[PDB]
């Protein structure tokens, strides 16, 4: 059950 | 100093303003415990939302959209503060920017908002997100952008109370039909997880998924090399086979059962468990679906998992065994008997899970009821297993149904 819901955009 | 950032973000000097909005973005992006509440209480939200309108400066709107994306990635509180500041209509408008980075950041922000919950995604859906979102799917899109689009798609299908509107499912299904032929693992995992959410919302949604034509391309993913793909695909087809007999038959007619030897022997217990759960929803079908399980040679392995599996797999296997005694013929049940189902099925009578004990007593009663000509012999098997002692001490159980049929079985068949 691994499927992201909310994602912070970090500097790559 | 955040009050100064907020002041400067208002400035009519573009350099001052861009610098302030970038400083806010940096404060929200440099680690993954950003000070989101500090920025919200500063008043920066309406200024960033205003910056989303600056079509003359794609860098300004990119930076503001990034800052808002990361505020919206926090608690539901913080996401709703972004929504309350009217960001959603401006993001929807940015979906039509000619500038791919700006589009992408708007998609990312909307994905965070949509993912907060179902009223929130219904608001975004009612404002028309779906069509522009799906219009991005193209061979010419960078793969990292396509993965962001598919993540937003999963987010649109994730809540079932209420599920997304019918019209939205109808729009999203053709996109999933396209993406299920993609080679990238992330795309496939997102696509199949979206399908597993859609098939979990009831039989009408399952019928829509079936009607899209996607199932013959979903079933072969049960044998994908990537276990995350397999896990999602097995969840999705498992959901489908919780439907009617005919919907189940669609999956069976995609050669589904030929994939199960590798799932039942898979190193991963969660795979074994979901596989037996699937199978249990097949043995609950008509006699022909029961026979299809028998002829795929899956029964010895189901019994082996009932014997030696983890507790969750053992529970699903007890369900598969008990279910088979619904529409199965006497000879299909006799085949189970010849496969030595009885000892590992009776050993489950001791588990503290009252539901499992119930299901096993159920199955034992049903099989004994229809095995007349040598029911006595089956009693021997229950007796010499040590299972008769299990029943005669379940006599003193707490649950009403449990000791009820324990007394019933010991009375009629012993």
Numbering used by the authors:
A (entry chain B): 432 to 443
B (entry chain A): 72 to 485
The authors write:
Nuclear translocation of the p50/p65 heterodimer is essential for NF-κB signaling.
The best importin α3 crystals diffracted to 2.10 Å for the p50-NLS complex and 2.85 Å with p65/p50-NLS peptides. The two isoforms adopt a nearly identical conformation of the Arm core, and the p50-NLS P1–P5 residues (Arg361-Lys365) are not only superimposable in the two complexes (RMSD of 1.095) but also occupy equivalent positions. However, the p50-NLS binds more intimately with importin α3 than α1, contributing 18 hydrogen bonds, two salt bridges, 152 Van der Waals contacts, and burying a surface area of 855.8 Å2 versus nine hydrogen bonds, no salt bridges, 118 Van der Waals contacts, and burying a surface area of only 780.4 Å2 in α1. In our binding studies, only the p50-NLS was indispensable for importin α3 association, suggesting this NLS is the primary determinant for nuclear import, in agreement with a prior transfection study. The p50-NLS occupies the major NLS pocket making 18 hydrogen bonds and two salt bridges in complex with importin α3 versus only nine hydrogen bonds with importin α1.
